[PDB]
Amino acid sequence: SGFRKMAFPSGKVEGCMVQVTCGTTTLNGLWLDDVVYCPRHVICTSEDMLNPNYEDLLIRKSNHNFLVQAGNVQLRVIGHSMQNCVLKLKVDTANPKTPKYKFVRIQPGQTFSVLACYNGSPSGVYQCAMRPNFTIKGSFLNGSCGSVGFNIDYDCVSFCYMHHMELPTGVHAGTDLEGNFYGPFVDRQTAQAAGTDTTITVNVLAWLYAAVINGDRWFLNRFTTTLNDFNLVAMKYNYEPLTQDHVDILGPLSAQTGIAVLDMCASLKELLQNGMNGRTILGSALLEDEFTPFDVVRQCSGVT
Amino acid sequence: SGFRKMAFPSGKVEGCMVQVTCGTTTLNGLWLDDVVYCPRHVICTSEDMLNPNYEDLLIRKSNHNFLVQAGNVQLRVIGHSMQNCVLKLKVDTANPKTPKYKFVRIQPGQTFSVLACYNGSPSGVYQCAMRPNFTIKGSFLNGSCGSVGFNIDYDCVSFCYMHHMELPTGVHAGTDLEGNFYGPFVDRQTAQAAGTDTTITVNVLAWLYAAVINGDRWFLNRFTTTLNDFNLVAMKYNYEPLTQDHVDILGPLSAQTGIAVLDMCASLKELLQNGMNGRTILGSALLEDEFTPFDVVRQCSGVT
Numbered sequence: 247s248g249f250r251k252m253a254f255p256s257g258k259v260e261g262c263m264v265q266v267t268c269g270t271t272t273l274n275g276l277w278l279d280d281v282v283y284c285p286r287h288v289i290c291t292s293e294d295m296l297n298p299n300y301e302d303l304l305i306r307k308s309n310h311n312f313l314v315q316a317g318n319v320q321l322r323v324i325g326h327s328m329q330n331c332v333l334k335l336k337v338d339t340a341n342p343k344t345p346k347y348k349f350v351r352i353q354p355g356q357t358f359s360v361l362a363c364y365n366g367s368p369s370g371v372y373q374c375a376m377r378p379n380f381t382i383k384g385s386f387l388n389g390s391c392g393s394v395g396f397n398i399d400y401d402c403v404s405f406c407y408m409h410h411m412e413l414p415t416g417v418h419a420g421t422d423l424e425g426n427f428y429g430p431f432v433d434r435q436t437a438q439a440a441g442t443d444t445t446i447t448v449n450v451l452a453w454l455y456a457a458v459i460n461g462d463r464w465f466l467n468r469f470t471t472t473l474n475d476f477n478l479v480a481m482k483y484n485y486e487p488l489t490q491d492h493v494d495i496l497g498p499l500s501a502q503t504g505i506a507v508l509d510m511c512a513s514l515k516e517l518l519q520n521g522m523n524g525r526t527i528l529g530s531a532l533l534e535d536e537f538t539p540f541d542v543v544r545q546c547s548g549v550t
Numbered sequence: 551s552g553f554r555k556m557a558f559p560s561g562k563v564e565g566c567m568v569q570v571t572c573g574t575t576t577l578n579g580l581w582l583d584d585v586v587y588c589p590r591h592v593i594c595t596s597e598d599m600l601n602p603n604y605e606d607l608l609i610r611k612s613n614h615n616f617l618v619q620a621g622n623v624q625l626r627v628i629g630h631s632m633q634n635c636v637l638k639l640k641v642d643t644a645n646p647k648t649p650k651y652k653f654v655r656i657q658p659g660q661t662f663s664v665l666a667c668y669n670g671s672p673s674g675v676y677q678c679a680m681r682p683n684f685t686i687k688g689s690f691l692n693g694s695c696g697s698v699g700f701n702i703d704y705d706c707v708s709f710c711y712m713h714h715m716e717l718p719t720g721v722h723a724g725t726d727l728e729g730n731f732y733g734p735f736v737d738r739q740t741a742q743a744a745g746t747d748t749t750i751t752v753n754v755l756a757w758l759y760a761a762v763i764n765g766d767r768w769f770l771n772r773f774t775t776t777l778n779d780f781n782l783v784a785m786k787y788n789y790e791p792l793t794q795d796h797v798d799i800l801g802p803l804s805a806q807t808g809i810a811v812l813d814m815c816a817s818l819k820e821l822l823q824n825g826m827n828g829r830t831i832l833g834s835a836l837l838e839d840e841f842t843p844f845d846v847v848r849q850c851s852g853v854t
């Protein structure tokens with residue numbers, strides 16, 4: 247028993263982190279097979295930040311200008327290309343520690359683990375969610391760019407995020423491993439305000455099911471609701487609308503606990519309307535939304 | 551910027567996890583050099599749980615009764631011994647992935663990462679604290695015993711915890727790597743109630759400093775206090791007494807922010823007396839106590 251914000255074991259990803267330097271900028275790269283992936287802003291200087299023309303800046307760079315170091319050993323760069331907002335540096339050596347991997351583009355509400363790195367070296371691992379406004383609330387300092395987000399299914403690492411920047415509001419933006427930003431963000435030092443950070447309703451419900459499985463049941467009430475009634479309350483509280491797809495996804499949790507999804511929605515509706523009254527659920531005084539129904543099932547079943 | 555409950559990268563510890571089976575019980579072991587460490591309750595059956603005599607039960611076990619598997623390959627057990635509540639299984643092969651390591655016995659209030667494992671396979675990593683009542687609030691299911699807690703200093707892993715059991719209240723108890731339980735707990739299926747789970751005051755203050763560094767400053771007030779005045783309030787709220795050692799340890803955070811430790815104590819005193827009023831600090835609606843001053847400095851400076 248017990249329920250924690252759990253990250254995937256990071257070893258498979260640690261074996262892929264390298265340092266990439268171009269000019270005076272040093273950030274992280276992800277070395278898979280004979281390609282090193284990194285944010286294209288590694289080619290930017292102090293005067294490029296504001297309005298960079300990446301194609302023009304890249305013309306002035308050759309393979310030897312990209313310094314890639316894996317541990318304390320230098321990798322030889324034999325090719326380079328820009329794909330959207332990432333650079334792909336072809337090296338002459340396949341990463342011997344390359345795990346089985348996929349590149350996936352996640353949807354908002356989905357969670358993943360981040361291996362925060364500096365100078366190609368791992369500093370820590372934590373669990374994130376892609377917010378509904380396509381930002382992530384991470385913990386990244388200068389030099390953390392190129393750190394990646396991932397999920398693991400048995401022995402296959404699905405990379406879903408590469409860190410690129412911090413918005414002036416302290417929230418984070420990045421791309422998938424094809425270099426496409428999540429949301430409307432651009433790799434430029436300009437005014438980029440994030441949209442409404444709504445709560446991921448299906449994740450809150452999954453976490454309420456995790457709480458029941460763990461003995462925290464005080465919030466269970468004698469009520470039920472409908473999807474339309476619940477959604478009127480969800481809109482009022484900046485919660486994402488709940489769909490029948492979300493109800494279906496919560497099916498295993500509803501089955502395990504014997505609590506119908508709409509009954510849990512009625513509990514969540516009362517928690518939104520009445521508050522917690524100074525009480526806690528799974529050691530939290532707010533409704534946690536960075537656990538998907540899949541995460542709850544996985545943690546409550548011990549998938550390795 | 552941003553502040554997350556961050557665990558150490560787990561790769562160095564993943565390389566040490568093995569499966570240990572004795573009779574019908576299978577749990578995890580930690581393989582360092584040519585020794586595999588695991589909870590001694592691996593030798594217990596259904597009728598042993600209630601009042602086991604470990605020395606007597608161990609007499610009926612030989613080296614060949616301990617099945618140790620590292621990945622899909624079997625390790626040959628050439629010796630076994632009991633040290634306090636852990637068994638040490640000498641194998642004929644040194645773990646080739648043994649990192650530089652130490653065994654440390656931590657104090658209450660100290661944090662560490664847990665690599666939760668099942669069948670010798672890692673499932674997840676999360677950050678814990680040794681509570682002042684010597685329990686940990688982890689996330690462990692049946693078969694998670696032998697999962698370990700650790701801290702990392704550059705390339706040296708300091709193992710501090712090995713999971714042994716769950717108390718009837720859903721909190722966890724375990725030993726250091728010498729087999730000595732933290733707190734008064736015993737590896738027996740008996741009434742073991744935990745003491746008062748007080749809040750780790752110095753950690754809450756460290757996290758309030760992390761909040762200021764990250765721009766969350768609404769809770770800063772125009773007041774100050776003394777150690778004795780603050781401690782009268784801390785006692786009332788089941789917070790641990792703050793000592794001059796704790797003030798000294800918070801010195802770097804006080805220096806970086808320019809907020810005297812006693813001024814932060816006065817902010818914490820008002821938060822205890824007035825509550826949060828529906829506000830949040832670093833995305834939390836309660837005062838977080840599982841970040842030490844060292845963790846705050848490390849995360850805010852990017853130590854790899």
Ligand SMILES: *CCC(=O)N(c1ccc(C(C)(C)C)cc1)[C@@H](C(=O)NC1CCOCC1)c1cccnc1
Pocket residue numbers: 273287290294295296386387388389390391392410411412413414433434435436551
């Ligand atoms: C990894 C580089 C870095 O530290 N940061 C960064 C990223 C991108 C740029 C470009 C060239 C695209 C402008 C520059 C610097 C920052 C970062 O994103 N800083 C922003 C702060 C708000 O104004 C715009 C620049 C970084 C800091 C902390 C965390 N992650 C990235």
Ligand SMILES: *CCC(=O)N(c1ccc(C(C)(C)C)cc1)[C@@H](C(=O)NC1CCOCC1)c1cccnc1
Pocket residue numbers: 247577591594598599600690691692693694695696714715716717718737738739740
């Ligand atoms: C790893 C073994 C296991 O799953 N658990 C366990 C541990 C120790 C025992 C002895 C032989 C010492 C009695 C038995 C079983 C449990 C566990 O600790 N269960 C307890 C629940 C409360 O009553 C006492 C037995 C375990 C479950 C979940 C997490 N960690 C351990």
